[PDB]
Amino acid sequence: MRPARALIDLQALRHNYRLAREATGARALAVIKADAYGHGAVRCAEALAAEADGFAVACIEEGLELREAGIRQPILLLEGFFEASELELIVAHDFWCVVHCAWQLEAIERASLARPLNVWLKMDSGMHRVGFFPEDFRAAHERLRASGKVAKIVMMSHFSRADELDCPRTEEQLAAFSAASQGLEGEISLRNSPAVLGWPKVPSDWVRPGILLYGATPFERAHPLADRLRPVMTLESKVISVRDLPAGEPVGYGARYSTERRQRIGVVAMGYADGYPRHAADGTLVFIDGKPGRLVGRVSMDMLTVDLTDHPQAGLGSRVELWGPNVPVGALAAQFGSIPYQLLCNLKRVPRVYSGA
Amino acid sequence: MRPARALIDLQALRHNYRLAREATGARALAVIKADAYGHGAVRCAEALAAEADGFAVACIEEGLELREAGIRQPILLLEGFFEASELELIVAHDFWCVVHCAWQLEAIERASLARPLNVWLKMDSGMHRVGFFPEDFRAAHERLRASGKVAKIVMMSHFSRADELDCPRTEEQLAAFSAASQGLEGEISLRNSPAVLGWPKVPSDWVRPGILLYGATPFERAHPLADRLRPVMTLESKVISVRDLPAGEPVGYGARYSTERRQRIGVVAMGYADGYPRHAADGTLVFIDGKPGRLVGRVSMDMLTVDLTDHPQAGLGSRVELWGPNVPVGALAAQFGSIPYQLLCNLKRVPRVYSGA
Ligand SMILES: *Cc1c(COP(=O)(O)O)cnc(C)c1O
Ligand SMILES: *Cc1c(COP(=O)(O)O)cnc(C)c1O
Ligand SMILES: NCCCC[C@@H](N)C(=O)O
Numbered sequence: 101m102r103p104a105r106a107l108i109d110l111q112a113l114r115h116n117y118r119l120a121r122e123a124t125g126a127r128a129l130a131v132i133k134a135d136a137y138g139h140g141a142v143r144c145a146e147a148l149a150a151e152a153d154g155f156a157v158a159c160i161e162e163g164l165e166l167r168e169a170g171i172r173q174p175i176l177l178l179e180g181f182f183e184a185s186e187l188e189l190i191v192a193h194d195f196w197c198v199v200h201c202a203w204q205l206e207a208i209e210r211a212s213l214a215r216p217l218n219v220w221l222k223m224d225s226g227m228h229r230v231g232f233f234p235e236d237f238r239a240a241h242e243r244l245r246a247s248g249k250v251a252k253i254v255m256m257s258h259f260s261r262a263d264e265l266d267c268p269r270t271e272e273q274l275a276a277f278s279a280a281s282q283g284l285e286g287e288i289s290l291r292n293s294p295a296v297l298g299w300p301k302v303p304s305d306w307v308r309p310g311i312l313l314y315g316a317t318p319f320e321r322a323h324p325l326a327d328r329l330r331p332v333m334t335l336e337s338k339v340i341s342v343r344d345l346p347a348g349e350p351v352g353y354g355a356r357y358s359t360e361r362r363q364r365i366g367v368v369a370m371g372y373a374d375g376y377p378r379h380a381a382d383g384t385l386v387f388i389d390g391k392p393g394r395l396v397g398r399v400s401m402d403m404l405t406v407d408l409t410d411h412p413q414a415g416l417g418s419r420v421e422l423w424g425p426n427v428p429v430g431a432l433a434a435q436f437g438s439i440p441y442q443l444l445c446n447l448k449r450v451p452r453v454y455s456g457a
Numbered sequence: 458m459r460p461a462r463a464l465i466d467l468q469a470l471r472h473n474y475r476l477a478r479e480a481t482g483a484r485a486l487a488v489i490k491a492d493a494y495g496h497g498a499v500r501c502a503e504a505l506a507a508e509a510d511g512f513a514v515a516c517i518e519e520g521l522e523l524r525e526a527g528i529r530q531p532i533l534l535l536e537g538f539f540e541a542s543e544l545e546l547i548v549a550h551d552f553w554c555v556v557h558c559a560w561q562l563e564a565i566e567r568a569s570l571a572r573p574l575n576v577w578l579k580m581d582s583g584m585h586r587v588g589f590f591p592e593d594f595r596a597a598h599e600r601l602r603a604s605g606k607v608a609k610i611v612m613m614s615h616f617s618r619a620d621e622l623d624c625p626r627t628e629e630q631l632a633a634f635s636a637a638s639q640g641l642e643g644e645i646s647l648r649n650s651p652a653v654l655g656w657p658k659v660p661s662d663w664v665r666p667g668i669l670l671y672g673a674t675p676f677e678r679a680h681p682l683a684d685r686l687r688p689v690m691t692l693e694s695k696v697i698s699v700r701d702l703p704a705g706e707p708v709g710y711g712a713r714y715s716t717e718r719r720q721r722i723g724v725v726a727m728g729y730a731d732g733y734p735r736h737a738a739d740g741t742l743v744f745i746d747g748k749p750g751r752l753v754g755r756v757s758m759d760m761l762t763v764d765l766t767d768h769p770q771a772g773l774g775s776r777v778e779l780w781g782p783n784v785p786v787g788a789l790a791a792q793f794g795s796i797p798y799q800l801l802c803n804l805k806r807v808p809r810v811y812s813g814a
């Protein structure tokens with residue numbers, strides 16, 4: 101069969117979750133939306149179940165997936181419900197539910213509920229994605245309280261630029277949040293991975309680490325705490341064909357790359373349909389049999405090419421690391437204006453082989 | 458549940474397959490590797506089964522998927538086998554098999570085979586991906602013939618730049634192929650979608666249309682025949698939140714976009730984990746309730762934002778077309794240096810709803 105695969109190190113996952121808790125002194129929801137950012141939500145939840153305060157996902161189906169698999173820890177629906185008809189199963193499966201807008205509030209007020217809802221009331225404190233404006237937040241809170249449909253309320257917001265350590269936007273958003281929620285009782289939840297790792301003045305009773313769990317830094321440069329993260333996914337394959345070429349020969353579609361000299365090229369069983377980025381430029385780092393090398397030629401749907409010229413011992417069957425502990429996925433992604441989040445989420449087709457369960 | 462979904466129009470698929478056959482007068486393998494470029498290999502094969510000469514996939518597992526579903530038409534493994542241990546099931550499932558390199562040839566020569574193999578001998582005629590060099594092709598052919606392990610041989614190659622209609626690389630590759638295969642008996646197979654649509658002087662007994670099946674042109678400009686293709690996938694969702702903003706307010710992560718004026722923004726239940734590109738720039742075309750609109754703000758993993766200011770009738774629950782028959786997926790992709798192939802292949806999480814079966 102094809103030698104492509106994605107290794108998922110669950111010990112590394114636990115390590116990274118623990119770092120988040122230790123750094124903050126807060127309860128932490130492991131953010132495992134989008135199939136744990138491509139790593140496998142059920143398997144990652146199972147691995148964290150014994151020690152996690154809870155999980156967070158994008159929608160009720162991701163939530164139900166976890167419940168069907170036997171996850172009993174709290175689960176937060178980060179966007180709430182999309183249809184009011186979801187409410188009976190939200191209550192029955194005991195999902196914690198974000199409320200970010202007026203129509204959701206109204207649906208709760210007129211809904212017939214078997215048990216009260218645990219609501220995470222979301223404020224738009226400056227990212228202008230979802231949530232109530234600061235000036236509308238108090239009234240929303242009082243309406244949840246008055247409804248008799250709501251048990252606890254957690255007050256929440258989310259940062260747009262916490263990955264920019266020299267940008268004060270995070271400070272501004274916190275100030276707006278604190279001013280608009282002042283005097284309201286309940287826990288608060290503000291911090292994502294960059295704020296957990298890099299913004300120690302930001303408060304939170306509940307933190308919400310996503311990308312750090314997977315061992316990719318959200319930051320563009322080294323950081324003493326993010327430096328301690330352990331990459332979870334290794335995307336790897338093998339060389340399936342070798343070719344000797346004279347200089348000036350085009351490699352792959354579009355001839356973006358031509359051989360610079362007489363070279364030996366290896367074809368690898370990996371391509372953009374698997375999630376490896378088509379945008380990866382010539383000179384992109386790869387590891388070949390445990391040594392640094394480069395990608396040359398445009399990535400195809402199923403296949404990619406690497407330079408074997410300075411790797412005389414390498415050839416057919418050599419192992420190639422596309423990303424992992426030697427080839428950081430975030431540095432790769434930022435090369436062409438992406439973030440590690442996207443590449444990890446794009447993982448498809450290849451087997452996922454879990455270790456450390 | 459979340460309103461995101463991908464519509465797959467199987468009538469459009471059949472239409473596009475038929476165009477390829479009609480334009481060429483050749484037998485056509487429907488290329489449905491990578492889960493039919495994200496559209497669903499089994500469902501697309503089932504839809505084409507009654508009229509298709511055959512299918513082509515990337516590997517034995519994609520082949521087996523089709524056989525398990527009851528597909529009885531020929532199936533070509535475009536990269537052959539990755540391990541010689543695949544040969545017994547290749548023979549038993551009657552897979553046509555590419556042979557592109559010496560180690561595969563050698564494995565066939567020493568393999569014990571229950572039935573002979575139908576081999577597509579692949580030449581590297583200038584793309585320098587897989588296949589035998591022209592000067593090695595004849596000897597490879599004679600070795601297959603002499604082995605007594607091989608029934609038919611189809612002589613094949615593949616073009617690197619046929620999507621560039623003003624580039625003579627396609628002509629050069631054909632010349633090299635014809636010169637090196639001259640006098641050898643058997644059918645030939647050279648044409649992919651751009652060569653089917655745009656290079657009528659190129660011969661082929663078997664054509665291999667992939668991207669045109671899905672109703673996306675491989676070309677950067679209009680073309681009379683590619684213009685007749687019908688988009689197969691519609692990626693759509695709905696507006697899940699609306700927000701009025703003053704001018705100069707940042708929208709989404711990174712604040713790449715700030716409101717230009719007083720605006721109304723809508724949050725859509727679609728993001729890059731679903732396959733919608735994170736690279737999509739502000740001003741990207743979308744269709745909102747059947748009318749042109751634009752994307753503003755950076756796309757998030759699960760959510761994206763659109764400008765509703767000039768859409769006074771639109772709001773909560775409005776339908777948004779991300780790509781499809783009004784919003785061409787190829788034009789979107791080429792905006793930021795991608796191709797339609799990648800975006801379609803990246804489809805994840807959302808339901809696929811087939812019509813026309
Ligand atoms: C995705 C998400 C997170 C996790 O974000 P990271 O930046 O990956 O840590 C936390 N909170 C919310 C509201 C999210 O949507
Ligand atoms: C993917 C593939 C095709 C189909 O290509 P399109 O450009 O999508 O038409 C045809 N032949 C080979 C060898 C392929 O790998
Ligand atoms: N068919 C065009 C799409 C990209 C590459 C593809 N030829 C592959 O088999 O990898």
Ligand SMILES: NCCCC[C@@H](N)C(=O)O
Nearest residue numbers: 310441728757758759760
């Ligand atoms: N969590 C960061 C990844 C991108 C966006 C994500 N916040 C969403 O819920 O869409």
